Design an enzyme around this catalytic site. Sequence first.
Site, mmCIF file in Angstrom:
data_model
loop_
_atom_site.group_PDB
_atom_site.id
_atom_site.type_symbol
_atom_site.label_atom_id
_atom_site.label_comp_id
_atom_site.label_asym_id
_atom_site.label_seq_id
_atom_site.Cartn_x
_atom_site.Cartn_y
_atom_site.Cartn_z
ATOM 1 N N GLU A 130 26.202 57.726 29.914
ATOM 2 C CA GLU A 130 26.151 58.092 28.547
ATOM 3 C C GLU A 130 27.114 57.184 27.846
ATOM 4 O OE1 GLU A 130 27.737 58.986 25.523
ATOM 5 O OE2 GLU A 130 25.677 59.190 25.122
ATOM 6 N N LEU A 154 37.045 62.888 23.589
ATOM 7 C CA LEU A 154 35.652 63.379 23.788
ATOM 8 C C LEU A 154 35.563 63.970 25.190
ATOM 9 C CD1 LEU A 154 34.406 60.378 25.360
ATOM 10 C CD2 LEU A 154 36.414 60.186 23.723
HETATM 11 N N1 LIG Z 1 31.297 63.184 20.943
HETATM 12 C C1 LIG Z 1 31.290 62.030 20.269
HETATM 13 O O1 LIG Z 1 30.430 61.179 20.234
HETATM 14 C C2 LIG Z 1 32.462 61.699 19.384
HETATM 15 C C3 LIG Z 1 32.359 60.319 18.668
HETATM 16 C C4 LIG Z 1 33.538 60.075 17.791
HETATM 17 C C5 LIG Z 1 34.499 60.995 17.672
HETATM 18 N N2 LIG Z 1 34.550 62.196 18.410
HETATM 19 C C6 LIG Z 1 35.994 62.699 18.610
HETATM 20 O O2 LIG Z 1 36.392 63.391 17.359
HETATM 21 C C7 LIG Z 1 37.901 63.381 17.417
HETATM 22 C C8 LIG Z 1 38.373 62.603 16.206
HETATM 23 O O3 LIG Z 1 37.653 63.253 15.148
HETATM 24 P P1 LIG Z 1 38.263 63.345 13.635
HETATM 25 O O4 LIG Z 1 37.271 63.934 12.807
HETATM 26 O O5 LIG Z 1 39.539 64.072 13.769
HETATM 27 O O6 LIG Z 1 38.723 61.880 13.234
HETATM 28 P P2 LIG Z 1 38.177 60.507 12.663
HETATM 29 O O7 LIG Z 1 37.338 60.625 11.510
HETATM 30 O O8 LIG Z 1 37.948 59.817 13.994
HETATM 31 O O9 LIG Z 1 39.696 59.900 12.134
HETATM 32 C C9 LIG Z 1 40.039 60.622 10.874
HETATM 33 C C10 LIG Z 1 40.749 59.629 9.952
HETATM 34 O O10 LIG Z 1 40.039 58.642 9.655
HETATM 35 C C11 LIG Z 1 39.842 58.396 8.259
HETATM 36 N N3 LIG Z 1 38.618 58.831 7.623
HETATM 37 C C12 LIG Z 1 37.599 59.514 8.183
HETATM 38 N N4 LIG Z 1 36.643 59.790 7.326
HETATM 39 C C13 LIG Z 1 37.191 59.204 6.097
HETATM 40 C C14 LIG Z 1 36.711 59.069 4.625
HETATM 41 N N5 LIG Z 1 35.565 59.607 4.185
HETATM 42 N N6 LIG Z 1 37.484 58.420 3.731
HETATM 43 C C15 LIG Z 1 38.642 57.972 4.227
HETATM 44 N N7 LIG Z 1 39.147 58.033 5.443
HETATM 45 C C16 LIG Z 1 38.364 58.675 6.340
HETATM 46 C C17 LIG Z 1 41.062 59.202 7.690
HETATM 47 O O11 LIG Z 1 42.125 58.385 8.094
HETATM 48 P P3 LIG Z 1 43.767 58.131 7.602
HETATM 49 O O12 LIG Z 1 44.408 59.412 8.045
HETATM 50 O O13 LIG Z 1 44.101 56.853 8.246
HETATM 51 O O14 LIG Z 1 43.552 58.076 6.084
HETATM 52 C C18 LIG Z 1 40.850 60.464 8.531
HETATM 53 O O15 LIG Z 1 42.065 61.275 8.932
HETATM 54 C C19 LIG Z 1 38.286 62.838 18.846
HETATM 55 O O16 LIG Z 1 38.002 63.956 19.804
HETATM 56 C C20 LIG Z 1 37.169 61.743 18.878
HETATM 57 O O17 LIG Z 1 37.106 61.198 20.129
HETATM 58 C C21 LIG Z 1 33.472 62.549 19.274
HETATM 59 C C1 LIG Z 2 34.231 51.909 25.889
HETATM 60 O O1 LIG Z 2 33.787 52.373 24.570
HETATM 61 C C2 LIG Z 2 34.437 53.607 24.347
HETATM 62 C C3 LIG Z 2 34.322 54.301 23.157
HETATM 63 C C4 LIG Z 2 34.921 55.580 22.972
HETATM 64 C C5 LIG Z 2 34.800 56.223 21.578
HETATM 65 N N1 LIG Z 2 34.426 57.635 21.591
HETATM 66 C C6 LIG Z 2 35.438 58.650 21.304
HETATM 67 C C7 LIG Z 2 33.109 57.839 21.951
HETATM 68 C C8 LIG Z 2 32.704 57.907 23.306
HETATM 69 N N2 LIG Z 2 31.385 58.084 23.710
HETATM 70 C C9 LIG Z 2 30.404 58.154 22.754
HETATM 71 N N3 LIG Z 2 29.120 58.346 23.165
HETATM 72 C C10 LIG Z 2 28.098 58.360 22.275
HETATM 73 N N4 LIG Z 2 26.776 58.548 22.508
HETATM 74 N N5 LIG Z 2 28.415 58.277 20.967
HETATM 75 C C11 LIG Z 2 29.658 58.106 20.462
HETATM 76 N N6 LIG Z 2 29.689 58.075 19.102
HETATM 77 C C12 LIG Z 2 30.722 58.028 21.387
HETATM 78 C C13 LIG Z 2 32.083 57.878 20.982
HETATM 79 C C14 LIG Z 2 35.673 56.100 24.043
HETATM 80 C C15 LIG Z 2 35.700 55.398 25.269
HETATM 81 O O2 LIG Z 2 36.436 55.846 26.383
HETATM 82 C C16 LIG Z 2 35.909 56.637 27.448
HETATM 83 C C17 LIG Z 2 35.063 54.163 25.440
#
Ligand SMILES: NC(=O)c1ccc[n+]([C@@H]2O[C@H](COP(=O)([O-])OP(=O)(O)OC[C@H]3O[C@@H](n4cnc5c(N)ncnc54)[C@H](OP(=O)(O)O)[C@@H]3O)[C@@H](O)[C@H]2O)c1
Ligand SMILES: COc1cc(CN(C)c2cnc3nc(N)nc(N)c3c2)cc(OC)c1
Length: 205
Positions: A31, A24
């Site tokens: 935050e 992220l």
């Molecule tokens: N800005 C934010 O708040 C925030 C919060 C969370 C994530 N993100 C970020 O998004 C990225 C990861 O995103 P992502 O979309 O690639 O991964 P994800 O959903 O975190 O991990 C994907 C894996 O999880 C499982 N999964 C997810 N949805 C599923 C479903 N409906 N049924 C079965 N399995 C499911 C599958 O796993 P298997 O391959 O094990 O089957 C899928 O490959 C990183 O940059 C993470 O930090 C941002």
């Molecule tokens: C210590 O707990 C954590 C958790 C994460 C998980 N992650 C990808 C993440 C980060 N920030 C977030 N913010 C808000 N609002 N919502 C989310 N869904 C979220 C998800 C990363 C991390 O390392 C810096 C510390």
Amino acid sequence: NQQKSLTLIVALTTSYGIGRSNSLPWKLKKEISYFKRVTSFVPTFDSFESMNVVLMGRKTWESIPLQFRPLKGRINVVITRNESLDLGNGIHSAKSLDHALELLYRTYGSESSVQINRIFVIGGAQLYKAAMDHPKLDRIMATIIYKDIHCDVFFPLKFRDKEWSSVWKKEKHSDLESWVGTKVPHGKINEDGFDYEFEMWTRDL
Ligand SMILES: NC(=O)c1ccc[n+]([C@@H]2O[C@H](COP(=O)([O-])OP(=O)(O)OC[C@H]3O[C@@H](n4cnc5c(N)ncnc54)[C@H](OP(=O)(O)O)[C@@H]3O)[C@@H](O)[C@H]2O)c1
Ligand SMILES: COc1cc(CN(C)c2cnc3nc(N)nc(N)c3c2)cc(OC)c1
């Protein structure tokens, strides 16, 4: 299966970007600080027996610092289709969101000391997509990062766009703090070069 309502929590930019290269992309400890009060706030009284659950996709599992997990004082669950295995000392893996709720019900609720309060979806892009299509998801706790930061992963639904204005509504700040507990920064907040805001979005089931 289910009974209760799901909450989604996310930190996205005005363009729906949520990740980059499996992390992220920003530096926000205020935050990150907010994600914790949210994710672990159970009302004072019930605070005895009740613990919250965060749900997550495995990548995010991965993307979470070694030091940070399993996220403390919340039942931790990981959604992984190919539940290979799972290292943990009381952390579940479930084949989908649906299987995950059935696993928590069966596991807790019954002959348990441990009761669940609020259930959170923390990510990622794949799991976010499936919770958005779940009849039980009614609320989105969103932090908006007002920068056009480069990401490679996107939030799957433009919930904030006109196309979805008759389903998701942005609630009042007062009801944002009333839902979390703690007093929450009103307006625009700026930490490390970026301007961000806390919103609460809700839909009717
Ligand atoms: N800005 C934010 O708040 C925030 C919060 C969370 C994530 N993100 C970020 O998004 C990225 C990861 O995103 P992502 O979309 O690639 O991964 P994800 O959903 O975190 O991990 C994907 C894996 O999880 C499982 N999964 C997810 N949805 C599923 C479903 N409906 N049924 C079965 N399995 C499911 C599958 O796993 P298997 O391959 O094990 O089957 C899928 O490959 C990183 O940059 C993470 O930090 C941002
Ligand atoms: C210590 O707990 C954590 C958790 C994460 C998980 N992650 C990808 C993440 C980060 N920030 C977030 N913010 C808000 N609002 N919502 C989310 N869904 C979220 C998800 C990363 C991390 O390392 C810096 C510390």
